[PDB]
Amino acid sequence: SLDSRLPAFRNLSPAARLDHIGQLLGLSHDDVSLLANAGALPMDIANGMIENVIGTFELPYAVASNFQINGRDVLVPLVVEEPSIVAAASYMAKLARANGGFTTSSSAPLMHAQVQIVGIQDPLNARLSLLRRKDEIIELANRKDQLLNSLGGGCRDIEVHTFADTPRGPMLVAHLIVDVRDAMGANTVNTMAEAVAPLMEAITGGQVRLRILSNLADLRLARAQVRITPQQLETAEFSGEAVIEGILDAYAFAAVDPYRAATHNKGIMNGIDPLIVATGNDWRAVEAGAHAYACRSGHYGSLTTWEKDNNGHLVGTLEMPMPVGLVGGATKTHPLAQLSLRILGVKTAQALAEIAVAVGLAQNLGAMRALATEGIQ
């Protein structure tokens, strides 16, 4: 159906760009008019969104072209201040289309709720007392949020970890594992963590302290793949084969050197965070999950991978935590976050997460390609 190629888009006026988007999507007049004039976020909404509001602050709102996800073309809205990002994403997506576009998958939308318990004399024994009573705790967690349960989410499981060696004594930390459906999940799981805390306290005999989600959302992973052939990467100076080898050298550099990995992953987030902003979502949560995950091994490394396959084609992956929502907060109340969701066509939060990692992978590829092909001056 949709054709995201957007021929000539980069050279069109903003008004003509918006008209072409509107035709492809069948946008209503009200939708297009959200960009007829500045001020689409009414001040009454802005004033209800955060505290001490005195006005609004604009960033450019753009659409990356050419993206295709599991064979379906998609248009990607992005909000950011920095040049080259949107063009690089668009151009790498153009190259990806020739080899099948981006292929994506994701896990269920599972989030951790931590419950921290201090002052237990026998924490290792208390862990087993909690695990034996897992079903009772899960049932309690699922008591209140009737809507979530009806929609196919809810607390699925508990894990319990112990930290024997802290300067503040031993700590037991229970994790509720919660399917949050189309929410990012923080209010859902924080509510459950506060709800089960008295019962955990009764089972363990400790004092509950923190009841709080984890932003290291490593059970809520999204995955993207891309493939590029050497003919597509040939430049005036370098064969495509040589460019592929240069990109592999750049990847190996990021995998060994944290000073490079930080910059390399920053480029991924140049692609991802503007889509988070465009959909009214929390970009600090996505950033923290991204970079903490990059150093889960004890070494801060690259979130993407880059290889050559047995045909000599460049293949990239991005697998990372990606907690986002279609509901909640500004995603619902900002008229342009709703328009962004309309432009994307996503029907679940995990579908939005899959587009996010495709854009992050495309952005990293574009950044590496530029650096690997620039002549010595």
Ligand X SMILES: CC(C)(COP(=O)(O)OP(=O)(O)OC[C@H]1O[C@@H](n2cnc3c(N)ncnc32)[C@H](O)[C@@H]1OP(=O)(O)O)[C@@H](O)C(=O)NCCC(=O)NCCS[C@@H](O)C[C@@](C)(O)CC(=O)O
Ligand Y SMILES: C[C@](O)(CC(=O)O)CC(O)O
Residue at shortest CB range from ligand Y: 267
Task: Determine, following the binding rule CB under 6 A, whether residue 267 of this chain makes contact with ligand Y.
Answer: yes
Residue 89 · residue 362 · CB < 8 Å: yes
Strand order in the sheet with 221-228: 103-106, 221-228, 314-321, 304-308
By beta-carbon proximity to ligand X, the closer residue of 344 and 372 is: 372
Task: Determine, following the binding rule CB under 8 A, whether residue 165 of this chain makes contact with a copy of itself.
Answer: yes
Residue 96 · residue 228 · CB < 8 Å: yes
Q: How far is the CB of 13 from ligand Y (least distance, A)?
A: 26
What CA–CA distance (Å, rounded) separates 271 from 96? 16
Task: Determine, following the binding rule CB under 8 A, whether residue 353 of this chain makes contact with a copy of itself.
Answer: no
Residue 318 · residue 174 · CB < 8 Å: no
Task: Determine, following the binding rule CB under 6 A, whether residue 316 of this chain makes contact with ligand Y.
Answer: no
Q: Which member of 111, 183, 278, 353 binds a copy of itself (CB under 8 A)?
A: 278
Q: How far is the CB of 302 from a copy of itself (least distance, A)?
A: 12
What CA–CA distance (Å, rounded) separates 116 from 352? 32
Task: Determine, following the binding rule CB under 6 A, whether residue 263 of this chain makes contact with ligand Y.
Answer: yes
Task: Determine, following the binding rule CB under 8 A, whether residue 26 of this chain makes contact with a copy of itself.
Answer: no
Task: Determine, following the binding rule CB under 8 A, whether residue 323 of this chain makes contact with a copy of itself.
Answer: no
| Nearest in space to 320 (alpha carbons), one of 371, 366, 271 | 271
By beta-carbon proximity to a copy of itself, the closer residue of 165 and 309 is: 165
| Of residues 184-243, those binding ligand Y (CB under 6 A) | 186, 212
For tokens 């006005």, what's the residue? 55
By beta-carbon proximity to ligand X, the closer residue of 126 and 294 is: 294
What are the two backbone dihedrals, phi and then psi, of residue 290, each rounded to the nearest 5 degrees?
-65, -55
How far is C-alpha 296 from the chain's CA centre?
A: 17
Residue 260 · residue 298 · CB < 8 Å: no
Question: ∠ at Cα 278 (191, 13), nearest 5°?
Answer: 170
44, 51, 81, 82: the active-site residue = 82
Residue 113 · residue 190 · CB < 8 Å: yes
Q: Which member of 145, 182, 273, 354 binds a copy of itself (CB under 8 A)?
A: 273
Q: How far is the CB of 153 from a copy of itself (least distance, A)?
A: 18
By beta-carbon proximity to a copy of itself, the closer residue of 63 and 226 is: 63
By beta-carbon proximity to ligand Y, the closer residue of 128 and 370 is: 370
Q: How far is the CB of 309 from ligand Y (least distance, A)?
A: 23
By beta-carbon proximity to ligand X, the closer residue of 215 and 225 is: 215
Binding letters toward a copy of itself, positions 60-79, x by CB under 8 A: xxxxxx------------xx
31, 273, 282, 354: the active-site residue = 282
* 82 is an active site residue: yes
Classified as helix, coil or strand, 281 is coil
Q: Which member of 221, 224, 250, 359 binds a copy of itself (CB under 8 A)?
A: 250
Tally Cβ neighbours within 10 Å of residue 67.
26
What CA–CA distance (Å, rounded) separates 275 from 283? 9
* 44 is an active site residue: no
| Of residues 170-189, those binding a copy of itself (CB under 8 A) | 171, 173, 175, 187
Stretch that binds ligand Y, among 6-14, 117-125, 258-266, 354-362 (CB under 6 A): 258-266
Which residues are registered as beta bridge partners of 173?
116, 161
Residue 140 binds: one of ligand Y, ligand X, a copy of itself, none (C-beta under 5 to 8 A by kind): none
* 282 is an active site residue: yes
Per-position b or e across 2-20, b if 16+ CB within 10 A of its CB: eebbbeebeeeeeeebbeb
| Nearest in space to 362 (alpha carbons), one of 222, 228, 260, 218 | 228
| Of residues 331-350, those binding a copy of itself (CB under 8 A) | 334, 336
Q: How far is the CB of 198 from a copy of itself (least distance, A)?
A: 6
Q: How far is the CB of 146 from ligand X (least distance, A)?
A: 25
Tally Cβ neighbours within 10 Å of residue 217.
27
Q: Which member of 238, 257, 308, 313 binds a copy of itself (CB under 8 A)?
A: 257
What CA–CA distance (Å, rounded) separates 170 from 99? 53
Active-site positions?
82, 266, 282
